[PDB]
Amino acid sequence: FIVDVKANKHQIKQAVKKLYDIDVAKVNTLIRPDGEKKAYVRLAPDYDALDVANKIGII
Amino acid sequence: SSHKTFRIKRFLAKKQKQNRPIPQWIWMKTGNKIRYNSKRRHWRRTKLGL
Amino acid sequence: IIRKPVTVHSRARCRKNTLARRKGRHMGIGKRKGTANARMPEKVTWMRR
RNA sequence: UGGUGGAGGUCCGUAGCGGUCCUGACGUGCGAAUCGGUCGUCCGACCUGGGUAUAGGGGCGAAAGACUAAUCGAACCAUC
RNA sequence: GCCCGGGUGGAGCCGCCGCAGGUGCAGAUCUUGGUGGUAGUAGCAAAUAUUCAAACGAGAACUUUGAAGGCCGAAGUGGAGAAGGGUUCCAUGUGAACAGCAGUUGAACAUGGGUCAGUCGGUCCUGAGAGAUGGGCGAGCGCCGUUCCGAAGGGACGGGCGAUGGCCUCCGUUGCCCUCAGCCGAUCGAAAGGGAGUCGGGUUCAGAUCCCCGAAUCCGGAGUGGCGGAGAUGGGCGCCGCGAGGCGUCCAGUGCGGUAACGCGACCGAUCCCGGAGAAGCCGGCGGGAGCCCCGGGGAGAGUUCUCUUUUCUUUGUGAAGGGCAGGGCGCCCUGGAAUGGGUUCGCCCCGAGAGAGGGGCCCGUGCCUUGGAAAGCGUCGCGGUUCCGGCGGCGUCCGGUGAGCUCUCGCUGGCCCUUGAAAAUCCGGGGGAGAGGGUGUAAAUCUCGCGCCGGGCCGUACCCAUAUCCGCAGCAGGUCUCCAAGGUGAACAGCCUCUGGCAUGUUGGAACAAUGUAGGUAAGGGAAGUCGGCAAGCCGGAUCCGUAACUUCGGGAUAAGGAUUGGCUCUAAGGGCUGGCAGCCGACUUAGAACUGGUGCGGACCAGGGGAAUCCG
RNA sequence: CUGGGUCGGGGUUUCGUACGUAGCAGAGCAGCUGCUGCGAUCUAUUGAAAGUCAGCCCUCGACACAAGGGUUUGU
Ligand SMILES: [Mg+2]
Ligand SMILES: [Mg+2]
Ligand SMILES: [Mg+2]
Ligand SMILES: [Mg+2]
Ligand SMILES: [Mg+2]
Ligand SMILES: [Mg+2]
Ligand SMILES: [Mg+2]
Ligand SMILES: [Mg+2]
Ligand SMILES: [Mg+2]
Ligand SMILES: [Mg+2]
Ligand SMILES: [Mg+2]
Ligand SMILES: [Mg+2]
Ligand SMILES: [Mg+2]
Ligand SMILES: [Mg+2]
Ligand SMILES: [Mg+2]
Ligand SMILES: [Mg+2]
Ligand SMILES: [Mg+2]
Ligand SMILES: [Mg+2]
Ligand SMILES: [Mg+2]
Ligand SMILES: [Mg+2]
Ligand SMILES: [Mg+2]
Ligand SMILES: [Mg+2]
Ligand SMILES: [Mg+2]
Ligand SMILES: [Mg+2]
Ligand SMILES: [Mg+2]
Ligand SMILES: [Mg+2]
Ligand SMILES: [Mg+2]
Ligand SMILES: [Mg+2]
Ligand SMILES: [Mg+2]
Ligand SMILES: [Mg+2]
Ligand SMILES: [Mg+2]
Ligand SMILES: [Mg+2]
Ligand SMILES: [Mg+2]
Ligand SMILES: [Mg+2]
After folding, report:
1. Nearest nucleotide (C1') to the CA of residue C24?
2. Dist. CA C41–CA C45, nearest whole Å
3. Could you give the angle at the alpha carbon of B38 between the alpha carbons of B36 and B43, nearest 5°?
4. Do the chains B and C touch each other, judged by at least 3 C-beta pairs below 8 angstroms?
């Protein structure tokens, strides 16, 4: 995901959990050379990423 | 430098974002006098101050 | 895509010359550049003795 | 007398630092001070990075009026 | 100066009477802009070097692939960082401009991508220093000053009062009182100082100690603490029971062992006090351990095979964290008491303030074995997915020896100082003994022991790091801080050649080989007659064995000066370890002597002091 | 039916005696009971081998080539 530079890892985890009613294993955040924060969100093993991406709209 | 501060990185990001050329639909508006981007900066020529 | 073999750098010549030096060749007073002490330190000799 | 030991602002000499001579090259140059051979020193008053202090009639000077951002027998900038 | 004609042009302009002025250019090394001759000229010459074939393409000296010949030569033209740069990184596309020739190429242009951390750093500490308040000064913005002309603590074990919540039990939350007591001065100051804790394998076009897999680890937290184990369960008496074992009274129980160094899995404890670690220079010598190099073999795969070569080359392993054992060190302990002095080092040094000789203890154990761990990695041979695959299979990853060898690291010991070579954060041990627990048990308070539960937020992370990504106006022969470091020769990290890795000759090529240049050489006879002046060039040069003057501050002069030798090959002699005056088995480089031999040549390239006699000055 | 050119062959000349093979030549050394190996060098083949126009001399040997191409010029 792309998030704003004012978000903690805890905030990103909570936002994903509320929005997409899923579980998050961990979060890794970096700040792109162009300015916004990029977040890699690793889900729980019992949730697969492909179906969540389906529900999102990106396939 | 690999070690850099947050504000330095943000300023660099803004400067890098500013370096694109103009959109092709600009030059054929009605009240237009712009032919190209005259503020483009190359890393070899001008050294960004700092 | 093959990995080419390493170009040969043999040691047969230098080991044959080393065998000659073992026998005592090429070690005359003509073929020596350092001092006697530099070639074999007298302190080390005395230590061993 | 023979060993041993391993001192030293010690000697030859690399790296490093410096810059004698050719008054060589170049001299609208590679370069607003470089290049080559040859040279001085190379465990100590040694060489060097970063941090920090000293600001213009002031600083700093193993002292040449030297250095103080290619500017120094008084820096640079703006104004009068 | 002006009026007409012709042409171009496309929207304003002039005559006369007055009024007003920023009103007339050939120059001012005038200002700005433009353009010539020079001139298709100077020039595109620092660091050895390129050639053949094919492909793509309109187009090839410069692109790509293959082959050949070269260079850098581990103090690199290699592999990574710091500062600085800031998208230059990666993929695709283009060839207008730029890359001083060209380009199918680019650090150019155009589209898109790319930097993932509890453990790597910042973040914290303080250093040299910087800087508020109090105070002082100052017309004033302000300045001085950093403990100095200050009521500088907003904390706490515990006790008492008052209220609340939770089974109001016991504790928490406060509010008040009693009691307890320093600060070296707020705060800032290091991406090289201090600073707990992450390693291995795999993966991308570009990211990995960060992603995935697998093994760990530090810190912090937890009403009921989740749990084990420790604190712990004994003795006496009266008994019962044949005894085993079981009852009723008393008493103890904040662990135990070793003579000692000290050991064991824990083994209560506050304010306070003491100490340690953090926390220390430069140089020398020696020893231990790794990595690398080296030698003799087993494999596996390659190279040569005109002749020879049991041949030449490549490869042949195990992380962190535990456990054990080597191996190093001890200014640690016990017995005993030594001259006929002894022990011992390369050197030293040690001993009645207790040596030798026995027996122990402690610390580091980065080495070996094991858990990890063969399951992974790698080298080969063969099958698959005709591919999109951490694909599947076989085999192997073995045995030894040495070294004043190089680098790193640990340790011992000494030398030098009119030089004595940081602070704080943080952590730990001890001395004390204020307190707490229970009355014999369901034991309690308390545990730095074992396992178990939860979490670790924020920022940086791509690439260059330099004869093209930095600074010099630039792809500038300049400058710019570091780590890694093979073989041969050789004293050597010197010079020369080569391997791993890299590169295409430094912003162009072809053909000629005149003068004059720049940079190298060689010259008959003479030998400084040249020149201001032996400027430049030239002679000498390493090592071994002889020999070495005047003068002297007695240390030097000194490599003084001056001589001889140096190759190749075949021998001899001497210099050691381990096991059982001796015997056997291994072995690493040296030194000396001799013979033979070459067209007198042998420090054969490279490296590499000309000398002497005096004067002046310091 | 002539020409040069390339290659080859001779001549000249430079250097100094090639590789291989053989040797009861070789300071010596090791192994097997006189023989076999290592061994710098030496002797014979060996005035040998190699080079020799690119700006040397002759060839009458071989090979292919050579009756071309372009631009101009009138009293
Ligand atoms: Mg630049
Ligand atoms: Mg000296
Ligand atoms: Mg000159
Ligand atoms: Mg000139
Ligand atoms: Mg010297
Ligand atoms: Mg002053
Ligand atoms: Mg003067
Ligand atoms: Mg003045
Ligand atoms: Mg108009
Ligand atoms: Mg006007
Ligand atoms: Mg004019
Ligand atoms: Mg020209
Ligand atoms: Mg490099
Ligand atoms: Mg690199
Ligand atoms: Mg690129
Ligand atoms: Mg060009
Ligand atoms: Mg991890
Ligand atoms: Mg102040
Ligand atoms: Mg700080
Ligand atoms: Mg730090
Ligand atoms: Mg003793
Ligand atoms: Mg395996
Ligand atoms: Mg990187
Ligand atoms: Mg060249
Ligand atoms: Mg070139
Ligand atoms: Mg260049
Ligand atoms: Mg050049
Ligand atoms: Mg002469
Ligand atoms: Mg002569
Ligand atoms: Mg004269
Ligand atoms: Mg001279
Ligand atoms: Mg003298
Ligand atoms: Mg005199
Ligand atoms: Mg002097």
Report:
1. E590
2. 6
3. 120
4. no
CA distances, A44 to each of A9, A17, A52 (Å): 16, 11, 12
What is the C-alpha separation between A32 and B9, in angstroms, rounded?
10
The first and second tokens of residue A32, run together, are 């792109």
Tell me the torsion sign for CA atoms A21, A25, A31, A34.
negative
Cα–Cα dist A39/A9, whole Å: 9
From chain B, the residues in CB contact with A30 under 8 A are: none
Per-residue three-class SS string for chain B: CCCCCHHHHHHHHHHHHCCCCCCCCCCCCCCCCCCCCCCCCCCCCCCCCC
Resolution in A: 2.8
The whole-angstrom separation of Cα B31 and Cα B38 is 18
Instruction: Look at strands A24-31 and A2-3 and give their pairing.
Output: unpaired
How determined?
A: cryo-EM
Count of other CB atoms within 10 angstroms of residue A16 = 20
